[PDB]
Amino acid sequence: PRSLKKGPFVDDHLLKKVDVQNEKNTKQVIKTWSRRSTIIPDFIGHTFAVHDGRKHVPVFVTEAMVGHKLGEFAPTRTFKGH
Amino acid sequence: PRKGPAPKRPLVNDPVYGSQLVTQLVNKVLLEGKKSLAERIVYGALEQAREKTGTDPVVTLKRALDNVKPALEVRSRRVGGATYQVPVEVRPDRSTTLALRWLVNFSRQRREKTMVERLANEILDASNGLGASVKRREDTHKMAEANRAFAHY
Amino acid sequence: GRVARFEKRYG
Amino acid sequence: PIQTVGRRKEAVVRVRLVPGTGQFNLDGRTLENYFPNKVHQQLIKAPLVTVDRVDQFDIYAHLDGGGPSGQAGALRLAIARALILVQPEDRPALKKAGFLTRDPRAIERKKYGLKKARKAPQYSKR
Amino acid sequence: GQKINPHGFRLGITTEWKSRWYADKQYKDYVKEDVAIRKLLATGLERAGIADVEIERTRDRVRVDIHTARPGIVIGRRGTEADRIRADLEKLTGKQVQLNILEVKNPESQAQLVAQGVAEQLSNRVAFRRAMRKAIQSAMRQPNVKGIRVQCSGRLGGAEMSRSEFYREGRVPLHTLRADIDYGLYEAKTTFGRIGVKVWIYKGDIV
Amino acid sequence: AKKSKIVKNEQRRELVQRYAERRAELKRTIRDPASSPERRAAAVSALQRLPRDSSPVRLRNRDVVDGRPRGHLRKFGLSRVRVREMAHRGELPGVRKASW
Amino acid sequence: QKIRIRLKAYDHEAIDASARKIVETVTRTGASVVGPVPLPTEKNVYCVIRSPHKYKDSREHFEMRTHKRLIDILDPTPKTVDALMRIDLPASVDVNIQ
RNA sequence: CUGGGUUUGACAUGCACAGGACGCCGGCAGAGAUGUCGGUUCCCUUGUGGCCUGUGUGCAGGUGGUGCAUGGCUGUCGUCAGCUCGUGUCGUGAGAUGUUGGGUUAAGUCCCGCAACGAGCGCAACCCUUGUCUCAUGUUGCCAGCACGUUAUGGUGGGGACUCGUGAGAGACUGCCGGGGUCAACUCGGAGGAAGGUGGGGAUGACGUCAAGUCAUCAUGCCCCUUAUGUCCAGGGCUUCACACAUGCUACAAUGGCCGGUACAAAGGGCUGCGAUGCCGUGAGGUGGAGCGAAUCCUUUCAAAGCCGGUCUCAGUUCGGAUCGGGGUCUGCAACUCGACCCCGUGAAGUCGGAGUCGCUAGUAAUCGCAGAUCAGCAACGCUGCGGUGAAUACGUUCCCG
Fold first, then answer.
1. Please, do chains B and D touch (3+ CB pairs < 8 Å)?
2. Which candidate in G46, G55, G57 is best for mutational testing of the D interface (most D CBs within 10 A)?
3. Which terms in the Gene Ontology molecular function aspect does this entry carry (chain D)?
């Protein structure tokens, strides 16, 4: 994992998006492409349409998934069996 | 070996026993080039044998070698498009080699918790004629005898 | 709670 | 004084021989602190034994390169050379023992396509 | 892959390096500018036979020596060719670049020129047997030539099937290190593809 | 390889010299000492705003003429295929075949 | 005060020629020299694959060899130094003056 | 691959019309490409040149197809000894002879014969390294004899003696002796020598074969795309997993595991790189920066196997380390997919492996560590080198393979 001195990494795009989203206390679906951004306690209510490679899948954050990255909840490869 | 025999390596006499046979033995027990460990094992086994019996270790080692040295062996021979187990006489050097190899291996599969102890017990029983190497010589002689009909070619 | 662990790590 | 060298597969030994007792000084350490292996000691002293001049030469040696076995071999060659320099008329005794021959056995060069100098990669026909 | 390049076989023994300079930090950019110079000279001049190009460098000044069989073609009587090459070599970031145009003494004893001539004849209309025979005879007529082998391969004569043909005369000891083998390779442009011509010339040995 | 990709590699190099020289290096100096106040400074966020092409991590050592992206040698800046051909022709000073 | 002269070149003959020429000029100017002290040869080895595609087992080895010579003089009279900046040498050999 | 842009295009050069700006520097929007806004504005010299704009126009551009259209490069039979030519002779001719026969050799190597006489490419030699010695040679390398040293040592003044480094040379040529030999090749043994019979290992690969491989290093004939199969960007993929095959590493332990002490290498790398002393962490590491373009400094003064001592006592164990939980470090814009490493915990299969099969003849196999290239980091247990310790066996060509 990332070193603690550098601190958590969040892209500026969705960071600004969530600051303007939470300043009026309503959470609309936020369409993002940055699967590398970690989850901050500022995301607890917001629903993210994280990219997958083909489409954007809705991700609703909770308390538990803080500290993970948005990409962990958008599975890329699809496998059903042989 | 298509163009003729190859020269033999003249290995040196051992310093602390002065015998060719102990150097042959240490080279037989040698693994991965750790020569010092092999020498320690052989010297420890010889000293254990000397302590148990109370006499020189080289004489009992020679007695064990003579007890496990074979004289007749069987090799597969293809004469006239047919293969059979033909008893063949063994040269002295090959007999010493076979005896040493048998001793080292059968000591390797003993159950004395340490290779020095296993080797010492094996050489002692070979001196007294009870080792598994002695047994192996018995079966090889038996097999050579049982195929004597094929010795004519 | 995971949020507490974040506060420990970064604060 | 007299000084010779012995070389054995990347081991170089410089020897300085003086007519004192049988004291072995190997870079400030004795033949026991150095070379704690009886076979190595016998390999060292064999030229003295065949020349029967044991315990009548103080020996000072410089050791560098190789491992203990190569150092011992180079030291033996150096002692044989020093003896041939001190008493020339013992040459047949040493030469017929072979102690006057440098051993030209070196690490064979590694070859491309092979794991070792001669070991070849496993090849599967199937 | 059968035979290694004859020049590289004797690089430290008989033949010599064509680029002479020393660089430690600036080896890479020196190499870059050298290959740029070489490709520029190869593209710009094709009429006069460019047998060899040497590059020498020393700090700011760069010395480039080239050997051609028709020096008058590549040189400007008023320096016009010299002016053009000088200016576009300055543009190669060569700082001060100076040129020593030279001429080869025996064009028919030089492998690169022989291959160039054979390929040029091959390109327009000439049957390959004629070209090889003519080159071999012309080279053997020279005094120092002790043996020449000419080999060209490809769609010879515009055929659908590629072929390899070669003729030799005299001695060409490729395995002998001291023997100096002059090697020349140059590709013929034909309407049906590309034809490669290799020439080996043997002129005694250097000890 | 491809002319566009040969060119794009150079464009990255001129971008690197323009940006990574001081902009993408002072931010790293800010982040190094824990004593330095990085968190409010947003030196991380400011350095994210910079183009990705500023970062040398996006560079690729290609063959200086050929454009070959693999089998590269830093001493010559040349592919293994080209080094073999020019060394054989005696073009790289002080280079020859080996024996030992 | 003495100054070191360092010579580095890929060709042994050229570096030897440069060394003897430098010794000749410095002894012309009336200086004491230490002589061309040899130094270990630097060897840089590269291994490459012959074929453009596959055929990994066939490799070719190249080296780059650098020869080093050391020149040390004494009594640096200005005439010797001025002669030192006024020596022409092959482009192969470089000179380091310290 | 998905989606978002763009078309004389991401990049060249030429023909035209308009120009003084191109270009940067910041703001905003966007995932970014990009778009927009604010500030700065060419030198010639009167004909226009450099920059781009659009408008264009030739055109660029394809890792698009065909290695059965090709060049170049390479593997392979095989480092096997073979493959040919001129003239002559024989034959209606395809062809033969030379090149077959006896001997000999690693060898179409050589000798003797011979309707053949010669020649060429191959064989061998010339090249590199390694093993011995001589001359030259003393720094950053040695230190034997002298002095200063303080423990910290060639550390320091000094010295060529001995190593060593790198230049030149000598030295192995069946040279000599004895015996077989057609008195011929060749062969056996002996002396001298560091080395004896191409000393060891490299580089070197004949005519050709296999339409072998490579239009994805490159180049290239022909065909095809050209508002796209060109081109820019973000994200994803190349890492998917019921299986099969192949090459390796780690083990299944006592010839061993763990702990403590302790001894010996070679080769190589280092400038926006190596990075020491010191300090802080338990440890990756953090801070700091001495000295080093380096026989000088750093890679520790360099190793591990080794030796000595203690413990474990034959157990799925103090073996084995997979897998998994938690916590960190570093590189990088960023370690989710998908990095390496460190700490605590977890402790799987595995008890020496069927049919069958592989490598290796001596400093070799086996085993131990070190280094380099690529490289911000690494999937490296891979590859290319270096040294340490160092065996067994070859009766002999009936069988297997070429």
1. yes
2. G57
3. RNA binding; structural constituent of ribosome
Q: How far apart are CA F78 and CA E27, in angstroms?
A: 11
Nearest to A12 among F34, F39, F48 (CB): F48
CA angle F10, F14, F17 (to 5 degrees): 135
Which bases along strand H come within 7 Å of a protein CB atom? 1-2, 10-11, 25, 29-33, 60-63, 69-76, 119-133, 136-140, 142-144, 161-168, 192-195, 199-208, 211, 213-214, 216-222, 230-238, 240-242, 245-248, 254-256, 263-269, 271-272, 286-288, 293-295, 303-308, 313-314, 327-337, 339, 357-367, 373-376, 383-399
CA distances from D40 to A40, B63, B83, D60, D71 (A): 70, 29, 50, 17, 9
Q: Compute the C-alpha angle D52/D56/D62, nearest 5°.
A: 105
Instruction: Tell me if residue E16 falls in helix, strand or coil.
Output: coil
Say how many domains are in chain A.
1
Residues spanned by the domain of A1: 1-82
Token digits for B76? Answer: 């597969």
Chain D CB contacts of G59 below 8 Å: 112-113
* Domains of chain E from N-terminus onward: 16-105 (3.30.300.20), 106-207 (3.30.1140.32)
> What torsion do the CA atoms of D79, D83, D85, D90 make, to the nearest 10 degrees?
-140
Q: What is the CATH number of the domain that holds A21?
A: 3.30.860.10
Distance CA A58, CA A44 (A): 14
The CATH fold assigned to D1-126 is Ribosomal Protein S5; domain 2 (3.30.230)
The domain limits of chain D are 1-126
Question: In A, which residues are within 8 Å of C2 by CB distance?
Answer: 63-67
Chain-centroid distance, C-alpha E173: 21
Method by which the model was determined:
cryo-EM
β-sheet with D11-18: strand ranges across? D3-8, D11-18, D58-64, D24-26
Q: d(Cα F73, Cα F79) in Å, to the nearest integer?
A: 6
Domain B20-147: CATH class, spelled out: mainly alpha
Closest CA to D92 of D54, D50, D52: D50
Strands (E), G1-98: 4-9, 37-49, 59-72, 94-97
Instruction: Give me the domains of chain G, ranges plus CATH numbers.
Output: 1-98 (3.30.70.600)
Q: How many Å does it take to go from CA B7 to C1' H395?
A: 13
Question: Closest chain F residue to A12 measured between Cα atoms?
Answer: F45
